[PDB]
C-alpha cells in the first residue's frame, strides 16, 4: 500500500471527525488554554479573597 | 522549542549584544556609546519621567 517498509497505517479517522460543509465535526481546539490559565488564576484568588482568613 | 535550546538562544543573543561589531551591523549608532555592553546605575530604576529617561 506504501511500496516500501513503513508500518501498517492504523489511522482511526474513518468517522467524520473533520468539520466540513456537511459535518459538524468531532474536533475540539484548545485555544482557550492561554486565557483560561489567567482566568483560573483570577478566580482562585477571588476564592481566596472570599474565604480570606483561611487556607485557600 | 526545548527549554535548553531557548536558553541557549538567549545566551547567544546576549553574547552578540556584547560584541559591538554586530550592534552597528544591525544598525545602531555607536558614535557616542562609551562601552559595550552598556551598564547603568540602579538609580534609573526609580525614574518617573520620560524626560529623565
Amino acid at each position: 500500500v506504501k511500496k516500501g517498509n513503513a508500518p501498517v497505517p492504523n489511522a482511526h479517522f474513518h468517522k467524520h471527525w473533520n468539520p466540513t460543509g456537511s459535518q459538524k465535526g468531532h474536533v475540539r481546539c484548545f485555544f482557550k488554554q492561554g486565557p483560561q490559565k489567567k482566568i483560573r488564576r483570577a478566580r482562585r484568588q477571588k476564592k481566596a479573597a472570599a474565604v480570606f482568613p483561611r487556607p485557600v | 522549542v526545548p527549554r535548553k535550546v531557548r536558553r541557549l538562544a538567549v545566551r547567544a543573543a546576549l553574547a552578540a549584544s556584547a560584541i559591538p561589531a554586530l550592534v552597528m551591523a544591525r544598525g545602531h549608532n555607536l558614535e557616542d556609546v562609551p562601552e559595550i555592553p552598556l551598564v547603568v546605575p540602579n538609580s534609573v530604576e526609580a525614574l518617573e519621567k520620560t524626560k529623565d529617561a
Binding site: 468539520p19 466540513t20 460543509g21 456537511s22 481546539c29 485555544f31 | 522549542v1 535550546v5 531557548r6 541557549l8 538562544a9 545566551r11 547567544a12 543573543a13 546576549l14 553574547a15 552578540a16 549584544s17 556584547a18 560584541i19 554586530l22 562609551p34 562601552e35 555592553p37 552598556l38 551598564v39 547603568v40 546605575p41 538609580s43
Partner: protein, 52 residues
C-alpha cells in the same frame, strides 16, 4: 581576571559576566526566534459552510 565593565553616569567598574563569553550561535538564535514568534499567532479560517 575577567574584563571590567564601567557603569556610566557613576564612576564604578563591575566585572563582565560569563554570559558574554558564550558562543555566538546566530543559527540557534534564528531558529528559536522564528519558532517563538509563532506562539502569539491567532487562528484564521474560512467559514465552514463557505461556498457550499
Amino acid at each position: 581576571a575577567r574584563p571590567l565593565v564601567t557603569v556610566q553616569k557613576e564612576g564604578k567598574t563591575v566585572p563582565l559576566p560569563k554570559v558574554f563569553s558564550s558562543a555566538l550561535r546566530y543559527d540557534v538564535v534564528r531558529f528559536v526566534h522564528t519558532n517563538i514568534a509563532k506562539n502569539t499567532r491567532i487562528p484564521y479560517a474560512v467559514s465552514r459552510r463557505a461556498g457550499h
